[PDB]
Nucleic acid binder design. Structure first.
Lengths: 117, 149
RNA sequence: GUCAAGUGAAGAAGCGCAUACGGUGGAUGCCUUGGCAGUCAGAGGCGAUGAAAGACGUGGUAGCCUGCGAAAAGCUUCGGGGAGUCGGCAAACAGACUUUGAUCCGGAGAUCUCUGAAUGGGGGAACCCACCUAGGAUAACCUAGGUAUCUUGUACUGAAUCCAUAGGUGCAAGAGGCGAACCAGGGGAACUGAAACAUCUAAGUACCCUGAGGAAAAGAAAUCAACCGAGAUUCCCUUAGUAGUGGCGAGCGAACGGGGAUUAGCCCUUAAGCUUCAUUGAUUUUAGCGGAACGCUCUGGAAAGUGCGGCCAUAGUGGGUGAUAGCCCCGUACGCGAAAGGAUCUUUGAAGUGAAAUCAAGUAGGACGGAGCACGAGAAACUUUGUCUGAACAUGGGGGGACCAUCCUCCAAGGCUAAAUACUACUGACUGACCGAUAGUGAACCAGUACCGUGAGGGAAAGGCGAAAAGAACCCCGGAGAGGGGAGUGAAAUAGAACCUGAAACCGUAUGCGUACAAGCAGUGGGAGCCUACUUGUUAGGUGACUGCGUACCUUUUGUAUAAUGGGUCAGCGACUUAUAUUCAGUGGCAAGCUUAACCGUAUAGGGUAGGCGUAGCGAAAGCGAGUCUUAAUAGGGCGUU
RNA sequence: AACCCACUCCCGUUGAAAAGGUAGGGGAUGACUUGUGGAUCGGAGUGAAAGGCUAAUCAAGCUCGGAGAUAGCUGGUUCUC
RNA sequence: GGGGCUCAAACCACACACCGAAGCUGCGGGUGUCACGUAAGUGACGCGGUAGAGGAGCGUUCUGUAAGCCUGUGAAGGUGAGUUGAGAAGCUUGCUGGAGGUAUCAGAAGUGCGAAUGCUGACAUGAGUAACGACAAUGGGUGUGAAAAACACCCACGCCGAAAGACCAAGGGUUCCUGCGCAACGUUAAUCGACGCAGGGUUAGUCGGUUCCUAAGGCGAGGCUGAAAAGCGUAGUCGA
RNA sequence: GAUGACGAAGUGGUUGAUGCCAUGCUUCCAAGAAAAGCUUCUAAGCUUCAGGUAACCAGGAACCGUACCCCAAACCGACA
RNA sequence: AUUAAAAACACAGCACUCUGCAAACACGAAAGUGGACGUAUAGGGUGUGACGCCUGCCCGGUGCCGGAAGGUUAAUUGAUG
RNA sequence: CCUUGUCGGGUAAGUUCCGACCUGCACGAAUGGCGUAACGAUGGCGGCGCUGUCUCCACCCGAGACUCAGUGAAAUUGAAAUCGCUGUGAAGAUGCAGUGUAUCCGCGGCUAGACGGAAAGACCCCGUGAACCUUUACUGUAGCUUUGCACUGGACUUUG
RNA sequence: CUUGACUGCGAGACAGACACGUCGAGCAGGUACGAAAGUAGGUCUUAGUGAUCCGGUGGUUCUGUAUGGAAGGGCCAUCG
């Protein structure tokens, strides 16, 4: 039972080279470089499913900071005043109301100033 | 064949290190754990053989796969005669186990495509499980009780 | 309209990514005229009647293979075959041969150049020069025989030296050389292991040498056993990794006793046996002959495949035939078959041999020095002998592991013997959970070639059109090119000869988008824009401006982005196997038992329980035993006991 | 001068050349140079001696075997959870 | 760390708020173990990992299953797309291909490659870069040709001339000559060639060899010697 | 330009070798191949025809190598 | 040979020592052969190195040469216990 | 060795050279001691000539370089979208941090870096590695030599 | 005064990878001293040492290659 391994080696290399397509030069077309680029892309993608949740939070916080300062309040005073009250409303929909629904965000910052924090 | 000399000297050549042309890494070279003619015949105990037999005659009974006849004898060495004798029984793809194989019964069905004629000593677990029905004579059932217990 | 300030879309020398077509390249798949390994048989040699191995010739075209040998791809006969043929790469073409029977196949002959043991003498293999006899030939030769050395036998001859010895001449017979292994001998390592290394091991191995045969060798008790017995030798399984042996280290390793395969002993008051002949029948082999049973239909280039209905079978899983065939062909099961050779067995004569003469003397034994016996000379028996010695004579003699008595058992110093056993370069058949072109032989192909070496010696790469050459008439560009564009053939030519499929690396052309103020493992998270398909949206594909994070992989290390190692890349290949002993787990069968090994077997069955392990242990042992050992101890203690 | 040699520089070092070229240099009737044939060979030759040379190989040639020597060393060891 | 900071954006206190991790919590999945459960069935604690132990799988080739099933209404292979699984991977399909393939469950392994200065082929990069082999030396004309720096001829220029000339031995083995050619070889082109195809050419009493003779040395009947193989040698007979 | 016929002068002096006489001559030590062909002598034998020696006549001299390269592109250096 | 040409090696000359011929010595399990068809003015080994002047002291170690014959001492003998 | 010892000469200046001295680390008489004409592709010092050796290079002549046409290598190479500085860090960074500079791509040059390329460091270490040389290492052996016993005898004499 | 620097052991611990090592009540047999309880298995304590294999010596109940013995081996004590 001699078994000739050239038909499975090819499909495994096609799988790696298909995962590597779009990359520069030998990163997309030779196996020993495409393999490393695919593994590295996988590590970065694991890391960046975490940093996505880190980076969007900071953007929300920066937009809420900018929207609250137009109404005469900090970010931090706003988050404190929204817990002297009870809003349970997150950084995502507050940033969305900061850009889009500005009168509702003004109502929210006035109910935070109403709790005097 | 060949492969006595070192191919090159070991230093200076700037090349990887070889001691023969016929190394198994090389394409002329040998295979690393090259086979030699071995045996695959293993030991089955006598009791384990006889007890594996006694439990496939039991399944040939339960699955309605075993067929007992009083005697099974053909007249002439003709395959057409034995086809006609099996077609009365409604019987294709059969292992015929007689007590001793007659030469008429052997000359017929040694051409026939799905029929095998064996004796009781000459039956085996693979041919009992393989053929879709198993025809035995009464003398074969006597002989199986003598052998198997 | 003007002037300021702001803002910025196209415009790519070239690149990047994606896509689509190509090119290179030969992977992959599929295939096989080649290998590899067994089983069952064969016959086990060929050679002075000139071998194995060659050189040169030999053909209508003539290079190389393959045959042949100046009678040269053949000649003569017998026998078979019954329609084509003049071997292959190599298809065509000439001149022809064949039913008055070619070609082809087997048996027997004839010829058989030169080399090579090479043998008339030389020699640098395939060349050079001879002699004698017989016959034929007109100052030139030609035919057919001889002409080596050695050994043995014989005849003639005869030196010193008288006799006869050496020697010499002639006859007869035989030898020599080659071959993969097997066998019996002569001579015999070292690496290695011992974790160094000397004894030892490896190992009486490898190698070199000499003989013989189809087998050889050995073999008919001066053999073992314990007072019972067995009876030649060889081979296998055990006893047993046991007793021994060993720097008592590494290791090396029996025997008794069993189980078998095999079957015989004849003689030195002359035998079995084996040869060679002549016969007596018989069997095989070298070639062949016959050898059953299928039609219609669909798809298709083509049917063996589809659908339906049959038939044959001592023949059904063979090969190939335009796709997969028991019924189309060659075959297969099954019967038949030989002018002539060969081989085995059998009669019944014959000549030989065995065969050394007459039961064993420079022999047994011994002293030194070795070697072997599993046994490193050791308490060292037994065997063999290089040196030196040296017996008895059946009221002898040697063996029973130092040695001595007593018993038991054999008769050495002369021989010959079949089978079981080993091996396979060589044939034939069959087989494979063997390979399928980097594999399998080094070698599927014009391979031990090409090539490399002064040589010994080393040693490649290279398979596939199509079912059939139907291998592309003709036209056009081009150099009466190369290569193409058509046309034809074909089912298919992006099957067009470098020809099945035709991957990846690598190189292009086309389209989309992004790229010329931007700094780094080239991605990843976010993300605008643009472009295509859709059909539109909270989509799919392609680019990815801009932006956060971000120093490859391996290996080694305490630690590597490391300026440590390793890798140019791709595609193939490339590393825990196998055998035998054993231990543990899991899983089965039998169970106080289980299990067989060789071997027998109409053969994976069944038989064969010799042997192995278990049912009892203790002790160094004798021994004793549910106990035993130690001990003065019925005490203690160690080990053991539903 | 031929011939034989090889002291110096420079070039060349992937060479025209695996040891050369060009300029200069030494011997050049002899312990000279050379053709052709022959002899000596691997613990063995030959050596006006250097471990020189023995087929571009030399403190023990080449080749084939023992042989897949041995390596407490280095390198490598292939799919998944 | 930089910009920059001086009733601070530095320091010493104190206060309140905020950001900040793969930590915790929420929400949705998968898995291990343990306990419960007529086995749906939940709970609870877990779940970084090198050497290493243990457990469970995928895929490749072969054999049985298989005289089965699939397949020329198109196999294997190749190349895309979609899709499904924790993964190895699976499944469906467009094109290519043009004859084979192997559900399932078992048996067996030449069973999985990126590294070994790994083997062997193809192909890159360096790069259209260095070179193109003595610095005797070339310039026109004419022809032939598809095309001439290079071929041939003419004119002229150089160079060797104790050779760059004529010849013999060795070694080579047809390279010689003539027709036809230019793919490859020629470090460029080639109409030329020591290249390809096909023909032809080598004439001896006197030149060389054989033949005659011997040197070194070889071999050597017999012979001496040596475990064998063989060594040495007499007669001899090769050897320029 | 290829070929057939015809075809002038073709003599004298000097210098001359590393060639020849010369395997000579002189000299010196380092003291300078073998064997055959050749000349000659007999032996063993012949019958002393054969054999030898001259003359003359007729006839013969086998086989093999010869092309081409050798201060080389053809040999030895993997190469023009 | 291919990084060292020299002061290195060689050399004439010198001295020591061996060798009486079947030589010492060398290659050869041996036969044989070289030395040498030579013969002590010859032949081997060793050291020194033309020439000129010279070549001093030491015989304890070690070697080599000779010497008595006392101790020791091997195989082999094989008394005695 | 100290050491470039001291003194003389040579030079403007002399660790070298020549002549002495003798405190010879550590000369010394055939592993010869001292001299020595001639002879060295021999070592070291000084001089005359001579000059691109030099100050200090200028110009010229050919052959490459450069461009054009034809042919067409190499070592190396994990992939590259391949800056400077200051730090940091397996401790000397194009790739890390901070920060400056910097439109995109050649060609000719030059070599400061890529711990550049070439050779599994030669030095050093290590291996219960190897090889070969030495000897008064250990163990042996060829050869040489002593005696016994054979081959090997008789005859006398001295003698236990 | 005298041999307890005893013989057979040895519950149990300490130490400890192993080989080794350390302490030891008690029991039996025999003894010292002491009138007797009792002390005594060396020394106030911890160093003063060396495995195995070979050999030597003295015992022995064991073995003892056909048997009776020996040889050699085994166990026990001891030496190099």
């Amino acid at each position: 039972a001699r078994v000739k391994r050239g038909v499975i080696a090819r499909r495994r290399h096609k799988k790696i080279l298909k995962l590597a397509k779009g990359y520069y030069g030998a990163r997309s077309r030779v196996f020993r470089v495409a393999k490393q680029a695919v593994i590295k892309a996988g590590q970065y993608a694991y890391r960046d499913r975490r940093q996505r949740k880190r980076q969007f939070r900071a953007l929300w916080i920066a937009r809420i900071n900018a929207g609250a300062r137009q109404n005469g309040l900090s970010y931090s005073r706003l988050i404190a005043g929204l817990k002297k009250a009870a809003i349970e409303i997150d950084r995502k929909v507050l940033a969305d109301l900061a850009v889009n629904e500005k009168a509702a965000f003004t109502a929210i910052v006035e109910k935070a100033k109403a709790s005097l924090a | 064949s060949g492969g006595g000399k070192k191919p090159w000297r070991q230093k200076g050549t700037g090349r990887a290190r070889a001691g023969t042309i016929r190394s198994p890494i090389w394409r002329g070279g040998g295979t690393t754990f090259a086979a030699k003619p071995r045996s695959h015949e293993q030991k089955l105990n006598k009791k384990m053989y006889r007890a594996a037999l006694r439990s496939i005659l039991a399944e040939l009974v339960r699955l309605d796969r075993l067929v007992v006849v009083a005697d099974f004898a053909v007249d002439a060495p003709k395959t057409k005669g034995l086809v006609a004798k099996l077609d009365t029984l409604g019987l294709k793809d059969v292992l015929i186990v007689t007590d001793g194989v007659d030469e008429n019964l052997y000359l017929a069905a040694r051409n026939l495509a799905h029929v095998d004629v064996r004796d009781v000593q000459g039956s085996d677990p693979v041919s009992l499980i393989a053929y879709d029905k198993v025809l035995v004579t009464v003398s074969a059932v006597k002989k199986f009780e003598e052998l198997l217990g």
